[PDB]
Design a protein around this nucleic acid. Structure first.
Ligand SMILES: [Mg+2]
Ligand SMILES: [Mg+2]
Ligand SMILES: [Mg+2]
Ligand SMILES: [Mg+2]
Ligand SMILES: [Mg+2]
Ligand SMILES: [Mg+2]
Ligand SMILES: [Mg+2]
Ligand SMILES: [Mg+2]
Ligand SMILES: [Mg+2]
Ligand SMILES: [Mg+2]
Ligand SMILES: [Mg+2]
Ligand SMILES: [Mg+2]
Ligand SMILES: [Mg+2]
Ligand SMILES: [Mg+2]
Ligand SMILES: [Mg+2]
Ligand SMILES: [Mg+2]
Ligand SMILES: [Mg+2]
Ligand SMILES: [Mg+2]
Ligand SMILES: [Mg+2]
Ligand SMILES: [Zn+2]
Lengths: 144, 157, 130, 236
RNA sequence: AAACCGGUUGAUCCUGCCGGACCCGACCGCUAUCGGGGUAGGGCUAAGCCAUGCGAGUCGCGCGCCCGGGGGCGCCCGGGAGCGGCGCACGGCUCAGUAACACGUGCCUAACCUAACCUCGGGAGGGGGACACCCCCGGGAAACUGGGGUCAAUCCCCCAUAGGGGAAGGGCGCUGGAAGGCCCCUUCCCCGAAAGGGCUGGCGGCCGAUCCGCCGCCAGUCGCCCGAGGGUGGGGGCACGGCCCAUCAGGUAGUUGGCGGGUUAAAGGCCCGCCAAGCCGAAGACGGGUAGGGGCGGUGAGAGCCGCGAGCCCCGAGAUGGGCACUGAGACA
């Protein structure tokens, strides 16, 4: 169901598991995240399945990985209090979907993307760890 | 969940301590010279005076760039109403503006100061009964704050 | 159908397990559901067309006798007959009461097939031979 | 369906407080509610030909008003960007164009360019027969063969013949053309397209327009190409 | 106007409370001439109980019938009881429930439906039926309602074709950030349209003053069906923001997730079969209390405090308490 790889593939590659099924690393529309270093066959996977994500991305840290194909991550931000003119650090725990091709541990910073709802509390999925990010810039064409 | 309703516009000129002797003496003089009806009219004049001064205070605190578009038009509008005399004074000169300059612009005062009536209370009675034509139209409100250009059009019946 | 007996609205339970109040007193008709309509193994095929939300229509198989079995190894479609329901992995009580659901095995005339459609929603039994 | 006067669009040329508590609501025509004005409002407010709503309905009920070559007898018909409004018994023609003050204005136009309408391609769909369907900024559609519809990408402006149901001229969206901003704060501005920051979503790309040398920026969604240095049809 | 003044001492300097002076909101007392502007008035009190009246209709250019006046070509006009279409889910009221995806801001539906309307492409062939008003009788206090006869439709139904849905295999192609989508090809199963109807004018034909029509065609106009998109309305999802109490510390067991299914217009423990032990909590769970949320409003020189966060606008919920359905695009009205 999950076959690891000695090297990472690219978007559009087709890799066949020991079962002989061919899985193509789809293009999830986010060009600054690398595909996982292993392949799964889950139809709810965004890399190797039919799952479609939205363009909302968040960077969180894994807290509890003891649910099946899911994890408990923490989301952090800073809130301004106008009366005191100071900040407060707020955090919220979210439930997210962890695909089989992506392995996570507590304390690790991952990337999540909003999808359609998958369970009572899961609507976000781990797109990939932070280290699979890549620097990206837009295009700036100008007529002199 | 709050619905806006109008508030008194003479509150800005109202003193929060009415029971001062020197305060009572100065205000009683002002009502006598200009023939006002009650202290509400006198406070309403001061509320106008506080607007002219507080506005000039804020324009001073604005930056030179910000002050520039509003500086000359503010003084020009003050000149046309007849409150000030020079529309080209420094902006801090407006800060010392005095409430009597607003009371002179009252239509009742202008009828008396133009020699069109026997007394200031008679000139109030003239406007009230409708014998004072401002550019050909009857203006019956004695507290009308006449601007500069309309002042020369004041006639009697 | 949109029946309040099969209401598909949200629970009254938080993820923490605590209870929460009811924002709305009544059950909305838009969030209503319906009873199951999966067909039963019968001696003839009976189809019922149902009017649904927005004036649309859904084909319901009340009673199923034939299956459009398809042979992958031959690429032919046969409208074979159904003899018994071998087993229903989602719930054995479907096979125990002769009710056909998607993913169920059927011992058809040509052999065995796995039901590949939702017979309460599609209205036909598309089957693939094993 | 009602429309409270408070909920009316902000740019409409009507007083906000004084009047009734109601406003005429457009009847889901070929525009958007936020970006369209009903016909009865135009006849009563923008042209001032009717003093009441009944008088405006009477004028419209006679078919005196033609909108893009079709006589509209609905007083709640929506009018919007680049629409051609023609008054039959007087012979005057207007093209509702993006205005720097009124946000949308009735500008008189010559009778020659009355049948022409510049339409911005909002998207294409593949239809039966393999043909291509084009969707324009006012919801209008046009089905074309696959090869001809391949070369017309989204945001390209095409000058459409209302009289022949055809495409007179296709204006691709490339850097260096004349564009008019059709929505947002910078409405009414016409300038050269000379700068783009292509974002991940193309509709949200940052675009810059120049008019020697006032430079305004918007998103790519909010600009229509009106051609090269000469605008093809009178808009200003 | 960025303000103080009175009072604990025999006297004094403090601390520290309480009072005075001001604005606004509710109720009340005494008094009360006129006008202008304003979205003021059983909200702050019982979402307590109610006599009476009024509060959603319209269309004869969908349909037949009846009545009265007029006229000959083929009818004109007025009226009646109805069928039928569309609307009555908008609008109006109130503040019990709600600490919640209710509300606000910013985003999604690639997981969805949408009558009326707009645009592009295509279509309108064949054949049947019934029920009102009415007529002959009623029944019943009334509400309501029965039988026979009888004229129609844009009323209802069938047949054909278009089209549509599912399952499966392929593809150049389209959209789009990204295809479980669209388009094309192949196989099977299954469902399955339409009102060429009204009006106007022209032509011709059938027919007859006991008829005042019917038929074919043409044009104009208002309509009907299908495919695609828009529009509008709606269902659903997400991130974050906004009360008090620890004299409330552990709570949860469909509870948290996985897999397979059902149902839905549509994703989802929404529901079901199996598997696991997970889920929340002192960064305050759980429990209790209070409260419709916002735009906003009062006050202060301001920071801020308060809600008079009643009246006006937007969203929500409700219709004596609690439930459940019909019709319909949309209601559980
Ligand atoms: Mg949910
Ligand atoms: Mg102070
Ligand atoms: Mg003493
Ligand atoms: Mg005190
Ligand atoms: Mg009450
Ligand atoms: Mg008609
Ligand atoms: Mg009638
Ligand atoms: Mg009716
Ligand atoms: Mg309402
Ligand atoms: Mg009968
Ligand atoms: Mg019909
Ligand atoms: Mg399709
Ligand atoms: Mg048929
Ligand atoms: Mg018929
Ligand atoms: Mg499902
Ligand atoms: Mg539950
Ligand atoms: Mg009221
Ligand atoms: Mg009840
Ligand atoms: Mg009811
Ligand atoms: Zn995967």
């Amino acid at each position: 169901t999950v076959v690891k790889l000695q090297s990472r593939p690219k978007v559009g590659d087709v890799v066949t598991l020991p079962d002989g099924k061919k899985v193509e690393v789809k293009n999830i529309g986010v060009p600054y995240v690398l595909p996982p270093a292993a392949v799964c066959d889950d139809p709810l996977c965004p890399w190797h399945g039919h799952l479609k994500i939205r363009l909302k991305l968040l960077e969180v840290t894994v807290e509890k990985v003891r649910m099946h194909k899911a994890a408990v991550v923490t989301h952090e931000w800073v809130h301004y209090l106008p009366k005191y003119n100071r900040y407060e650090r707020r955090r919220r725990r979210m439930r997210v979907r962890v695909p089989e091709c992506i392995e996570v541990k507590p304390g690790d910073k991952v990337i999540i993307a909003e999808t359609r709802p998958l369970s009572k509390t899961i609507a976000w999925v781990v797109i990939g760890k932070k280290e699979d990010v890549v620097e990206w810039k837009a295009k700036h064409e100008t007529l002199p | 969940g709050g619905l806006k309703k109008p508030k008194k516009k003479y509150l800005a000129g109202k003193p929060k301590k009415i029971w001062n002797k020197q305060l009572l003496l100065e205000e009683l003089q002002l009502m006598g010279e200009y023939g006002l009806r009650n202290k509400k009219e006198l406070w309403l004049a001061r509320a106008r005076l506080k607007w002219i001064v507080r506005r000039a205070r804020a324009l001073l605190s604005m930056t030179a760039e910000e002050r520039a578009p509003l500086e000359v038009p503010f003084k020009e509008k003050l000149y046309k109403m007849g409150f000030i005399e020079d529309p080209n004074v420094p902006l801090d000169r407006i800060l010392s503006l005095d409430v009597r300059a607003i009371l002179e612009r009252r239509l009742q005062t202008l009828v008396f100061r133009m020699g069109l009536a026997k007394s200031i209370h008679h000139a109030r009675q003239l406007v009230v009964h409708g014998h004072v034509l401002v550019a050909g139209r009857r203006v019956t409100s004695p507290g009308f704050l006449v601007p500069r250009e309309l002042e020369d059009k004041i006639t009697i019946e | 159908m949109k029946l309040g007996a099969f209401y598909k609205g949200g629970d009254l339970v938080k993820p923490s397990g605590g209870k929460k109040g009811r924002v709305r007193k009544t059950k909305k008709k838009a969030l209503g559901g319906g009873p199951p309509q999966i067909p039963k193994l019968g001696e003839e095929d009976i189809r019922y067309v149902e009017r649904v939300r927005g004036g649309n229509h859904k084909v319901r198989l009340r009673q199923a006798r034939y299956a459009n079995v398809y042979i992958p190894k031959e690429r032919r479609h046969v409208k074979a007959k159904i003899l018994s329901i071998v087993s229903s992995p989602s719930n054995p009580d479907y096979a125990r009461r002769n009710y056909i659901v998607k993913g169920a095995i059927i011992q058809t005339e040509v052999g065995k097939a796995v039901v590949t459609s939702r017979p309460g929603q599609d209205g036909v039994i598309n089957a693939v031979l094993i | 369906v009602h429309l409270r006067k408070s909920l009316a669009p902000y740019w409409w040329p009507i007083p906000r407080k004084a009047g009734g508590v109601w406003a005429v609501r457009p009847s889901t025509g070929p525009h958007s509610l936020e970006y369209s004005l009903p016909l009865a409002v135009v006849v009563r407010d923008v042209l001032r030909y009717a003093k009441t709503l009944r008088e405006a309905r009477y004028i419209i009920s006679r078919g005196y008003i033609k909108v893009d070559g079709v006589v509209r007898k609905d007083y709640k018909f929506p009018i919007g960007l680049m629409d051609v409004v023609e008054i039959v018994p007087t012979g005057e023609i207007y093209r509702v164009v993006p205005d720097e003050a009124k946000y949308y204005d009735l500008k008189p136009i010559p009778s020659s360019e009355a049948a022409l309408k510049p339409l911005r391609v909002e998207g294409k769909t593949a239809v039966s027969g393999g043909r291509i369907q084009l969707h324009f900024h006012d919801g209008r559609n046009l089905i074309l063969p696959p090869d001809v519809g391949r070369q017309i990408k989204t945001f390209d402006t095409v000058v459409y013949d209302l009289e022949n149901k055809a495409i007179k001229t296709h204006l691709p969206l490339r850097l260096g053309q004349l564009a008019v901003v059709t929505h947002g704060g910078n409405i009414g501005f016409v300038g050269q397209f000379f700068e783009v920051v292509w974002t991940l979503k193309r509709r949200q790309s940052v675009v810059a327009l120049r008019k020697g040398e006032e430079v305004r920026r918007t998103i790519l969604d909010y600009i229509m190409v009106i051609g090269t240095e000469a605008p093809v049809v009178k808009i200003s």
